[PDB]
Amino acid sequence: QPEPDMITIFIGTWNMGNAPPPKKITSWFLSKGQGKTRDDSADYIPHDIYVIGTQEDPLSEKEWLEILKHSLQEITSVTFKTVAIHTLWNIRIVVLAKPEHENRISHICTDNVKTGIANTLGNKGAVGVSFMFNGTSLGFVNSHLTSGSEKKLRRNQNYMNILRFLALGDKKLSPFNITHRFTHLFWFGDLNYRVDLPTWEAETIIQKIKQQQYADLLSHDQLLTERREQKVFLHFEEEEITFAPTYRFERLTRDKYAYTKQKATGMKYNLPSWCDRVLWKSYPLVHVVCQSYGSTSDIMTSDHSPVFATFEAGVTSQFVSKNGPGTVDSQGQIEFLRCYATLKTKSQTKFYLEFHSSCLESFVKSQEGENEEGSEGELVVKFGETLPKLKPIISDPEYLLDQHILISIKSSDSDESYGEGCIALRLEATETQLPIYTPLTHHGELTGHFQGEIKLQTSQ
Ligand SMILES: NC(=O)N1CCN(c2ccc(F)cc2)CC1
Ligand SMILES: NC(=O)N1CCN(c2ccc(F)cc2)CC1
Protein backbone atom coordinates (compact mmCIF):
# COMPACT_ATOMS: atom_id res chain seq x y z
CA GLN A 1 0.00 0.00 0.00
CA PRO A 2 1.88 3.12 -1.25
CA GLU A 3 2.30 6.20 1.02
CA PRO A 4 0.25 9.22 -0.10
CA ASP A 5 1.79 12.38 -1.67
CA MET A 6 -1.53 14.30 -1.23
CA ILE A 7 -4.29 14.28 1.44
CA THR A 8 -7.53 16.30 1.77
CA ILE A 9 -8.23 18.14 5.01
CA PHE A 10 -11.68 19.36 6.14
CA ILE A 11 -11.67 22.46 8.40
CA GLY A 12 -14.96 23.28 10.20
CA THR A 13 -15.60 26.34 12.39
CA TRP A 14 -18.94 26.83 14.18
CA ASN A 15 -19.93 29.17 17.02
CA MET A 16 -22.83 27.03 18.43
CA GLY A 17 -24.33 29.95 20.45
CA ASN A 18 -24.44 27.74 23.60
CA ALA A 19 -27.28 25.65 21.98
CA PRO A 20 -27.24 21.94 21.08
CA PRO A 21 -26.94 21.19 17.34
CA PRO A 22 -29.91 19.88 15.27
CA LYS A 23 -30.19 16.08 14.57
CA LYS A 24 -28.53 16.45 11.07
CA ILE A 25 -25.28 18.46 10.44
CA THR A 26 -23.99 16.35 7.45
CA SER A 27 -24.21 19.44 5.08
CA TRP A 28 -21.27 20.94 7.06
CA PHE A 29 -18.92 17.93 6.43
CA LEU A 30 -20.12 17.74 2.77
CA SER A 31 -19.25 21.46 2.09
CA LYS A 32 -22.87 22.18 0.88
CA GLY A 33 -24.64 25.58 1.16
CA GLN A 34 -23.33 28.98 -0.01
CA GLY A 35 -19.90 30.01 -1.39
CA LYS A 36 -17.30 27.64 -2.93
CA THR A 37 -19.05 24.24 -2.44
CA ARG A 38 -17.91 20.64 -3.05
CA ASP A 39 -19.15 18.66 -6.10
CA ASP A 40 -22.03 16.14 -5.36
CA SER A 41 -19.90 13.44 -7.09
CA ALA A 42 -17.41 13.65 -4.10
CA ASP A 43 -20.06 13.13 -1.37
CA TYR A 44 -19.07 9.49 -0.54
CA ILE A 45 -15.28 10.23 -0.65
CA PRO A 46 -13.95 10.70 2.91
CA HIS A 47 -11.47 13.50 3.61
CA ASP A 48 -8.25 12.11 5.17
CA ILE A 49 -8.41 14.43 8.23
CA TYR A 50 -11.45 16.33 9.66
CA VAL A 51 -10.59 19.23 12.05
CA ILE A 52 -13.71 20.62 13.82
CA GLY A 53 -13.42 23.97 15.66
CA THR A 54 -16.30 25.06 17.90
CA GLN A 55 -16.96 28.17 20.01
CA GLU A 56 -19.69 28.66 22.62
CA ASP A 57 -19.92 24.79 22.55
CA PRO A 58 -22.44 23.66 25.26
CA LEU A 59 -21.71 19.91 24.80
CA SER A 60 -19.41 17.52 26.72
CA GLU A 61 -16.44 16.21 24.67
CA LYS A 62 -18.20 12.82 24.78
CA GLU A 63 -21.53 14.23 23.44
CA TRP A 64 -19.82 16.13 20.53
CA LEU A 65 -17.56 13.17 19.61
CA GLU A 66 -20.65 10.88 19.36
CA ILE A 67 -22.41 13.38 16.99
CA LEU A 68 -19.25 13.98 14.90
CA LYS A 69 -18.33 10.27 14.47
CA HIS A 70 -21.98 9.18 13.73
CA SER A 71 -22.27 12.07 11.16
CA LEU A 72 -19.07 11.05 9.28
CA GLN A 73 -20.01 7.34 9.46
CA GLU A 74 -23.46 8.10 7.92
CA ILE A 75 -21.76 10.14 5.12
CA THR A 76 -18.81 7.82 4.33
CA SER A 77 -19.58 4.42 5.99
CA VAL A 78 -16.09 4.89 7.61
CA THR A 79 -15.53 4.78 11.40
CA PHE A 80 -13.10 7.69 12.02
CA LYS A 81 -10.35 7.47 14.69
CA THR A 82 -9.99 10.29 17.26
CA VAL A 83 -6.46 11.90 16.93
CA ALA A 84 -7.05 14.64 19.49
CA ILE A 85 -9.69 16.65 21.38
CA HIS A 86 -8.94 19.72 23.49
CA THR A 87 -11.39 22.18 25.14
CA LEU A 88 -10.71 25.57 26.83
CA TRP A 89 -13.96 26.78 28.45
CA ASN A 90 -16.42 26.52 25.49
CA ILE A 91 -13.71 26.60 22.74
CA ARG A 92 -13.05 23.14 21.33
CA ILE A 93 -10.99 21.39 18.65
CA VAL A 94 -11.56 17.75 17.47
CA VAL A 95 -9.22 15.96 15.01
CA LEU A 96 -10.58 12.79 13.34
CA ALA A 97 -8.70 10.71 10.73
CA LYS A 98 -9.38 7.69 8.46
CA PRO A 99 -8.37 4.46 10.32
CA GLU A 100 -5.74 3.71 7.58
CA HIS A 101 -3.89 6.90 8.85
CA GLU A 102 -3.56 5.84 12.54
CA ASN A 103 0.06 4.53 12.10
CA ARG A 104 1.03 7.55 9.86
CA ILE A 105 0.12 10.04 12.67
CA SER A 106 2.53 10.64 15.59
CA HIS A 107 3.82 13.46 17.87
CA ILE A 108 0.27 14.63 18.74
CA CYS A 109 0.40 17.93 20.72
CA THR A 110 -2.54 19.93 22.20
CA ASP A 111 -2.43 23.33 23.89
CA ASN A 112 -4.55 26.40 24.66
CA VAL A 113 -3.98 30.11 25.27
CA LYS A 114 -6.25 32.37 27.39
CA THR A 115 -6.28 35.96 26.02
CA GLY A 116 -6.82 39.21 28.01
CA ILE A 117 -6.20 40.28 31.69
CA ALA A 118 -8.68 40.29 34.69
CA ASN A 119 -11.98 41.65 33.10
CA THR A 120 -11.00 40.28 29.62
CA LEU A 121 -9.66 36.83 30.88
CA GLY A 122 -12.40 34.16 31.31
CA ASN A 123 -13.84 33.02 27.97
CA LYS A 124 -11.75 34.06 24.87
CA GLY A 125 -8.59 32.35 23.55
CA ALA A 126 -7.49 29.46 21.35
CA VAL A 127 -7.08 25.73 21.34
CA GLY A 128 -4.60 23.94 19.07
CA VAL A 129 -3.49 20.53 17.83
CA SER A 130 -0.34 19.51 15.97
CA PHE A 131 0.97 16.14 14.73
CA MET A 132 3.18 14.54 12.10
CA PHE A 133 1.51 12.84 9.14
CA ASN A 134 4.48 10.78 7.78
CA GLY A 135 7.21 13.39 7.01
CA THR A 136 4.78 16.37 7.10
CA SER A 137 4.01 18.54 10.17
CA LEU A 138 0.37 19.77 10.50
CA GLY A 139 -0.83 22.50 12.92
CA PHE A 140 -4.46 23.51 13.64
CA VAL A 141 -5.60 26.55 15.68
CA ASN A 142 -9.25 27.26 16.69
CA SER A 143 -9.49 30.79 18.19
CA HIS A 144 -12.44 32.78 19.60
CA LEU A 145 -11.16 36.39 19.54
CA THR A 146 -12.57 39.50 21.27
CA SER A 147 -16.14 40.41 20.09
CA GLY A 148 -17.48 43.87 19.16
CA SER A 149 -17.13 46.09 16.05
CA GLU A 150 -14.92 48.68 17.93
CA LYS A 151 -12.30 46.09 19.15
CA LYS A 152 -10.37 45.11 15.97
CA LEU A 153 -7.10 46.22 17.75
CA ARG A 154 -7.91 43.85 20.69
CA ARG A 155 -8.50 40.99 18.17
CA ASN A 156 -5.08 41.74 16.60
CA GLN A 157 -3.49 41.55 20.10
CA ASN A 158 -5.37 38.27 20.82
CA TYR A 159 -3.84 36.92 17.53
CA MET A 160 -0.25 37.94 18.58
CA ASN A 161 -0.74 36.43 22.10
CA ILE A 162 -2.02 33.12 20.62
CA LEU A 163 0.87 32.81 18.09
CA ARG A 164 3.52 33.69 20.77
CA PHE A 165 2.24 31.35 23.53
CA LEU A 166 0.50 28.34 21.88
CA ALA A 167 3.08 25.50 22.43
CA LEU A 168 2.58 23.01 19.58
CA GLY A 169 4.98 21.14 17.29
CA ASP A 170 8.68 20.39 17.77
CA LYS A 171 9.92 22.09 21.06
CA LYS A 172 13.57 21.78 19.61
CA LEU A 173 12.44 24.59 17.19
CA SER A 174 12.93 26.94 20.16
CA PRO A 175 13.33 30.31 18.26
CA PHE A 176 10.18 29.60 16.15
CA ASN A 177 6.52 30.27 17.00
CA ILE A 178 3.63 28.21 15.52
CA THR A 179 3.73 30.40 12.30
CA HIS A 180 7.08 28.64 11.38
CA ARG A 181 6.72 25.15 13.02
CA PHE A 182 4.47 23.41 10.42
CA THR A 183 4.51 22.41 6.77
CA HIS A 184 0.79 23.45 6.83
CA LEU A 185 -0.79 25.64 9.54
CA PHE A 186 -4.60 26.13 9.51
CA TRP A 187 -5.97 28.94 11.70
CA PHE A 188 -9.76 29.23 11.97
CA GLY A 189 -12.49 30.16 14.43
CA ASP A 190 -14.86 32.94 15.41
CA LEU A 191 -12.21 35.60 14.70
CA ASN A 192 -15.01 38.14 15.30
CA TYR A 193 -13.87 40.77 12.72
CA ARG A 194 -16.87 42.84 11.53
CA VAL A 195 -18.07 44.76 8.47
CA ASP A 196 -17.11 48.33 9.52
CA LEU A 197 -20.03 50.42 8.10
CA PRO A 198 -22.29 52.93 9.93
CA THR A 199 -25.09 51.39 12.07
CA TRP A 200 -27.64 53.49 10.05
CA GLU A 201 -26.62 51.35 6.98
CA ALA A 202 -27.91 48.02 8.52
CA GLU A 203 -30.95 47.62 6.18
CA THR A 204 -28.76 48.54 3.13
CA ILE A 205 -26.27 45.82 4.14
CA ILE A 206 -29.15 43.27 4.46
CA GLN A 207 -30.42 44.37 0.97
CA LYS A 208 -26.92 43.80 -0.49
CA ILE A 209 -26.73 40.31 1.17
CA LYS A 210 -30.20 39.38 -0.32
CA GLN A 211 -28.87 40.39 -3.83
CA GLN A 212 -25.68 38.28 -3.20
CA GLN A 213 -23.63 41.51 -3.79
CA TYR A 214 -20.77 41.16 -1.27
CA ALA A 215 -18.09 43.40 -2.93
CA ASP A 216 -19.00 46.68 -1.08
CA LEU A 217 -19.32 44.68 2.21
CA LEU A 218 -15.95 42.77 1.90
CA SER A 219 -14.20 46.15 1.15
CA HIS A 220 -15.11 47.03 4.81
CA ASP A 221 -14.39 43.59 6.39
CA GLN A 222 -11.98 44.31 9.27
CA LEU A 223 -9.97 41.08 8.78
CA LEU A 224 -9.31 41.90 5.08
CA THR A 225 -8.46 45.59 5.78
CA GLU A 226 -6.24 44.78 8.83
CA ARG A 227 -4.44 42.03 6.78
CA ARG A 228 -3.95 44.51 3.85
CA GLU A 229 -2.29 46.97 6.29
CA GLN A 230 -0.10 44.11 7.75
CA LYS A 231 -1.68 44.53 11.23
CA VAL A 232 -2.60 40.81 11.65
CA PHE A 233 -2.24 37.35 9.98
CA LEU A 234 0.89 38.47 8.05
CA HIS A 235 1.85 35.75 5.50
CA PHE A 236 -1.45 33.84 5.89
CA GLU A 237 -3.84 33.10 2.97
CA GLU A 238 -7.66 33.09 2.86
CA GLU A 239 -9.84 31.90 -0.07
CA GLU A 240 -12.17 34.47 -1.69
CA ILE A 241 -15.39 34.87 0.33
CA THR A 242 -18.46 34.15 -1.89
CA PHE A 243 -20.97 33.27 0.93
CA ALA A 244 -23.27 35.60 2.93
CA PRO A 245 -22.11 36.91 6.32
CA THR A 246 -22.33 34.06 8.90
CA TYR A 247 -23.40 36.36 11.85
CA ARG A 248 -25.73 37.50 13.40
CA PHE A 249 -28.84 35.38 12.56
CA GLU A 250 -32.16 34.96 14.29
CA ARG A 251 -32.17 31.31 15.49
CA LEU A 252 -34.30 28.63 13.68
CA THR A 253 -34.33 30.46 10.29
CA ARG A 254 -31.60 31.94 8.00
CA ASP A 255 -34.15 34.50 6.73
CA LYS A 256 -33.25 37.27 9.22
CA TYR A 257 -30.14 39.08 10.46
CA ALA A 258 -30.66 40.16 14.13
CA TYR A 259 -28.41 43.26 14.26
CA THR A 260 -30.21 45.76 16.59
CA LYS A 261 -28.76 46.59 20.06
CA GLN A 262 -30.44 44.64 22.92
CA LYS A 263 -29.69 44.25 26.67
CA ALA A 264 -28.46 40.73 25.71
CA THR A 265 -25.76 42.29 23.34
CA GLY A 266 -24.60 44.86 25.94
CA MET A 267 -26.53 47.42 23.84
CA LYS A 268 -24.08 46.76 20.91
CA TYR A 269 -25.14 46.54 17.23
CA ASN A 270 -24.14 43.31 15.43
CA LEU A 271 -24.19 44.34 11.69
CA PRO A 272 -23.96 41.26 9.45
CA SER A 273 -20.31 40.17 9.46
CA TRP A 274 -17.95 37.37 8.37
CA CYS A 275 -16.99 36.43 11.99
CA ASP A 276 -16.24 32.82 11.09
CA ARG A 277 -13.09 32.26 9.05
CA VAL A 278 -10.46 29.76 7.87
CA LEU A 279 -6.92 30.91 6.95
CA TRP A 280 -3.72 28.91 6.29
CA LYS A 281 0.05 29.30 5.93
CA SER A 282 2.15 26.59 4.30
CA TYR A 283 5.95 26.46 3.77
CA PRO A 284 7.10 27.92 0.46
CA LEU A 285 6.44 25.80 -2.72
CA VAL A 286 4.43 23.13 -0.86
CA HIS A 287 1.21 22.17 -2.68
CA VAL A 288 -1.89 23.53 -0.88
CA VAL A 289 -5.13 24.23 -2.78
CA CYS A 290 -8.44 25.34 -1.22
CA GLN A 291 -11.21 23.16 -2.81
CA SER A 292 -14.16 24.60 -0.76
CA TYR A 293 -14.93 27.63 1.40
CA GLY A 294 -18.52 28.31 2.37
CA SER A 295 -21.28 28.26 4.94
CA THR A 296 -24.21 25.87 5.51
CA SER A 297 -27.84 27.09 4.90
CA ASP A 298 -29.71 24.31 6.84
CA ILE A 299 -28.09 24.37 10.41
CA MET A 300 -29.96 27.11 12.33
CA THR A 301 -29.66 26.30 16.09
CA SER A 302 -27.02 29.13 16.48
CA ASP A 303 -26.91 32.85 15.64
CA HIS A 304 -23.86 31.78 13.55
CA SER A 305 -23.90 29.49 10.50
CA PRO A 306 -21.15 26.82 10.27
CA VAL A 307 -18.21 27.51 7.91
CA PHE A 308 -16.36 24.77 5.98
CA ALA A 309 -13.06 24.85 4.09
CA THR A 310 -11.39 21.87 2.35
CA PHE A 311 -7.80 21.66 1.23
CA GLU A 312 -5.59 19.46 -0.95
CA ALA A 313 -2.26 19.36 0.94
CA GLY A 314 1.11 18.00 -0.20
CA VAL A 315 2.60 15.36 2.20
CA THR A 316 5.95 13.51 2.10
CA SER A 317 6.92 9.95 3.20
CA GLN A 318 8.98 9.03 6.32
CA PHE A 319 12.26 8.65 4.31
CA VAL A 320 14.88 5.97 5.20
CA SER A 321 18.22 5.49 3.33
CA LYS A 322 21.28 3.25 4.06
CA ASN A 323 22.89 6.40 5.66
CA GLY A 324 20.40 8.76 7.42
CA PRO A 325 18.51 8.77 9.62
CA GLY A 326 21.25 8.30 12.29
CA THR A 327 24.19 9.61 10.20
CA VAL A 328 24.99 12.20 7.43
CA ASP A 329 25.10 11.41 3.65
CA SER A 330 28.41 12.96 2.44
CA GLN A 331 26.82 13.13 -1.10
CA GLY A 332 24.55 15.97 0.20
CA GLN A 333 25.41 19.58 1.07
CA ILE A 334 23.68 22.98 1.34
CA GLU A 335 25.86 26.07 0.77
CA PHE A 336 24.77 29.72 1.36
CA LEU A 337 26.70 32.36 -0.73
CA ARG A 338 26.60 36.22 -0.53
CA CYS A 339 23.94 36.19 2.24
CA TYR A 340 22.78 39.24 4.21
CA ALA A 341 19.98 39.99 6.68
CA THR A 342 18.33 43.46 6.69
CA LEU A 343 16.78 44.20 10.12
CA LYS A 344 14.42 47.02 11.21
CA THR A 345 16.06 47.00 14.73
CA LYS A 346 17.63 50.28 16.00
CA SER A 347 20.00 48.14 18.20
CA GLN A 348 23.79 47.57 17.83
CA THR A 349 24.69 44.01 18.93
CA LYS A 350 26.46 41.38 16.77
CA PHE A 351 24.09 38.81 15.18
CA TYR A 352 24.49 35.10 14.25
CA LEU A 353 22.16 32.69 12.32
CA GLU A 354 20.63 29.37 13.44
CA PHE A 355 19.60 26.89 10.68
CA HIS A 356 16.93 24.36 11.80
CA SER A 357 15.60 21.53 9.58
CA SER A 358 14.45 17.87 9.94
CA CYS A 359 17.01 17.23 7.09
CA LEU A 360 19.86 18.02 9.66
CA GLU A 361 20.87 15.92 12.70
CA SER A 362 20.62 19.10 14.80
CA PHE A 363 20.44 22.88 14.29
CA VAL A 364 23.56 24.73 13.09
CA LYS A 365 24.88 28.03 14.60
CA SER A 366 26.86 30.38 12.27
CA GLN A 367 29.68 32.82 13.12
CA GLU A 368 28.62 36.44 13.74
CA GLY A 369 28.01 38.51 10.57
CA GLU A 370 29.45 42.00 9.84
CA ASN A 371 27.09 44.93 10.62
CA GLU A 372 27.02 47.80 8.06
CA GLU A 373 24.74 50.90 7.81
CA GLY A 374 22.16 50.64 4.92
CA SER A 375 21.47 53.78 2.76
CA GLU A 376 17.93 54.36 4.28
CA GLY A 377 18.81 53.90 8.04
CA GLU A 378 18.59 50.00 8.21
CA LEU A 379 20.95 47.46 9.84
CA VAL A 380 22.52 45.13 7.20
CA VAL A 381 24.21 42.00 8.64
CA LYS A 382 26.65 40.52 6.03
CA PHE A 383 27.48 36.78 6.24
CA GLY A 384 29.40 36.77 2.88
CA GLU A 385 30.73 33.23 2.18
CA THR A 386 31.32 32.58 5.94
CA LEU A 387 28.07 30.50 6.54
CA PRO A 388 28.66 26.82 7.49
CA LYS A 389 28.13 24.02 4.93
CA LEU A 390 24.94 22.14 6.00
CA LYS A 391 25.14 18.30 6.08
CA PRO A 392 21.78 16.68 5.33
CA ILE A 393 20.98 13.20 6.70
CA ILE A 394 19.85 11.96 3.21
CA SER A 395 21.24 13.10 -0.20
CA ASP A 396 18.47 11.56 -2.36
CA PRO A 397 16.96 14.49 -4.35
CA GLU A 398 13.45 12.88 -3.96
CA TYR A 399 13.80 13.68 -0.21
CA LEU A 400 16.06 16.72 -0.11
CA LEU A 401 14.26 18.96 -2.69
CA ASP A 402 11.06 18.56 -0.54
CA GLN A 403 12.76 19.97 2.62
CA HIS A 404 12.89 23.45 4.19
CA ILE A 405 15.48 25.38 6.27
CA LEU A 406 14.14 27.62 9.05
CA ILE A 407 16.41 30.60 9.79
CA SER A 408 16.60 32.63 13.00
CA ILE A 409 18.87 35.69 13.33
CA LYS A 410 19.90 35.95 17.02
CA SER A 411 21.63 38.64 19.12
CA SER A 412 25.10 37.50 20.38
CA ASP A 413 24.41 39.64 23.54
CA SER A 414 21.01 38.11 24.46
CA ASP A 415 20.63 34.91 22.30
CA GLU A 416 17.14 36.27 21.51
CA SER A 417 15.70 35.81 17.94
CA TYR A 418 15.22 39.15 16.09
CA GLY A 419 13.72 37.42 13.04
CA GLU A 420 12.58 34.02 11.78
CA GLY A 421 11.99 32.86 8.20
CA CYS A 422 11.90 29.82 5.95
CA ILE A 423 13.74 28.81 2.71
CA ALA A 424 12.45 25.99 0.40
CA LEU A 425 14.96 23.51 -1.09
CA ARG A 426 12.51 22.98 -4.07
CA LEU A 427 15.17 24.57 -6.36
CA GLU A 428 15.10 25.07 -10.18
CA ALA A 429 18.57 23.39 -10.33
CA THR A 430 21.11 21.51 -8.19
CA GLU A 431 24.87 22.32 -8.13
CA THR A 432 23.84 25.88 -9.27
CA GLN A 433 23.99 29.23 -7.34
CA LEU A 434 20.32 30.38 -7.16
CA PRO A 435 18.72 33.40 -5.42
CA ILE A 436 16.96 32.70 -2.06
CA TYR A 437 14.76 35.00 -0.02
CA THR A 438 12.52 35.00 3.08
CA PRO A 439 10.87 37.80 5.00
CA LEU A 440 11.86 37.68 8.72
CA THR A 441 9.25 38.02 11.48
CA HIS A 442 9.32 38.05 15.30
CA HIS A 443 6.04 37.55 17.21
CA GLY A 444 4.55 37.33 13.66
CA GLU A 445 5.46 41.02 12.84
CA LEU A 446 7.91 41.96 10.01
CA THR A 447 11.44 42.57 11.46
CA GLY A 448 13.50 42.38 8.25
CA HIS A 449 14.65 40.20 5.32
CA PHE A 450 17.18 37.46 4.56
CA GLN A 451 18.48 37.05 0.99
CA GLY A 452 21.48 35.62 -0.84
CA GLU A 453 22.15 32.54 -2.87
CA ILE A 454 22.04 28.77 -2.30
CA LYS A 455 23.96 25.88 -3.88
CA LEU A 456 22.35 22.46 -3.26
CA GLN A 457 24.25 19.16 -3.91
CA THR A 458 22.13 15.94 -4.06
CA SER A 459 23.19 12.35 -4.95
CA GLN A 460 21.97 13.05 -8.56
N1 LIG B 1 2.62 8.58 18.76
C1 LIG B 1 1.44 8.34 19.59
O1 LIG B 1 1.32 8.93 20.61
N2 LIG B 1 0.40 7.39 19.20
C2 LIG B 1 -0.76 7.15 19.96
C3 LIG B 1 -1.97 7.73 19.23
N3 LIG B 1 -2.05 7.34 17.78
C4 LIG B 1 -3.19 7.72 16.97
C5 LIG B 1 -4.47 7.56 17.49
C6 LIG B 1 -5.57 7.91 16.73
C7 LIG B 1 -5.40 8.40 15.45
F1 LIG B 1 -6.50 8.73 14.72
C8 LIG B 1 -4.13 8.56 14.92
C9 LIG B 1 -3.02 8.22 15.68
C10 LIG B 1 -0.71 7.19 17.11
C11 LIG B 1 0.39 6.64 18.01
N1 LIG C 1 1.85 38.79 -2.57
C1 LIG C 1 1.28 38.31 -1.32
O1 LIG C 1 2.03 37.82 -0.54
N2 LIG C 1 -0.14 38.42 -1.00
C2 LIG C 1 -0.68 37.96 0.22
C3 LIG C 1 -1.56 38.98 0.94
N3 LIG C 1 -2.63 39.56 0.06
C4 LIG C 1 -3.76 40.26 0.61
C5 LIG C 1 -4.87 40.43 -0.19
C6 LIG C 1 -5.99 41.10 0.27
C7 LIG C 1 -6.00 41.60 1.56
F1 LIG C 1 -7.11 42.25 2.01
C8 LIG C 1 -4.89 41.43 2.37
C9 LIG C 1 -3.77 40.76 1.90
C10 LIG C 1 -1.97 40.06 -1.19
C11 LIG C 1 -1.13 38.97 -1.84
Swiss-Prot record:
Specifically expressed in immune and hematopoietic cells. Expressed in bone marrow and blood cells. Levels vary considerably within this compartment. Present in at least 74% of immature CD34+ cells, whereas within the more mature population of CD33+ cells, it is present in only 10% of cells. Present in the majority of T-cells, while it is present in a minority of B-cells (at protein level). Tyrosine phosphorylated by the members of the SRC family after exposure to a diverse array of extracellular stimuli such as cytokines, growth factors, antibodies, chemokines, integrin ligands and hypertonic and oxidative stress. Phosphorylated upon IgG receptor FCGR2B-binding. This is Phosphatidylinositol 3,4,5-trisphosphate 5-phosphatase 1. Phosphatidylinositol (PtdIns) phosphatase that specifically hydrolyzes the 5-phosphate of phosphatidylinositol-3,4,5-trisphosphate (PtdIns(3,4,5)P3) to produce PtdIns(3,4)P2, thereby negatively regulating the PI3K (phosphoinositide 3-kinase) pathways. Able also to hydrolyzes the 5-phosphate of phosphatidylinositol-4,5-bisphosphate (PtdIns(4,5)P3) and inositol 1,3,4,5-tetrakisphosphate. Acts as a negative regulator of B-cell antigen receptor signaling. It is found in: Cytoplasm; Cell membrane; Membrane raft; Cytoplasm, Cytoskeleton. Interacts with tyrosine phosphorylated form of SHC1. Interacts with tyrosine phosphorylated form of DOK1. Interacts with tyrosine phosphorylated form of DOK3. Interacts with tyrosine phosphorylated form of SLAMF1/CD150. Interacts with PTPN11 in response to IL-3. Interacts with receptor EPOR. Interacts with receptors MS4A2/FCER1B and FCER1G. Interacts with receptors FCGR2B and FCGR3. Interacts with receptor FCGR2A, leading to regulate gene expression during the phagocytic process. Interacts with GRB2. Interacts with PLCG1. Interacts with tyrosine kinases SRC and TEC. Interacts with c-Met/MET. Belongs to the inositol 1,4,5-trisphosphate 5-phosphatase family. The chain holds residues 398 to 857 of 1189 of the full protein. The SH2 domain interacts with tyrosine phosphorylated forms of proteins such as SHC1 or PTPN11/SHP-2. It competes with that of GRB2 for binding to phosphorylated SHC1 to inhibit the Ras pathway. It is also required for tyrosine phosphorylation.
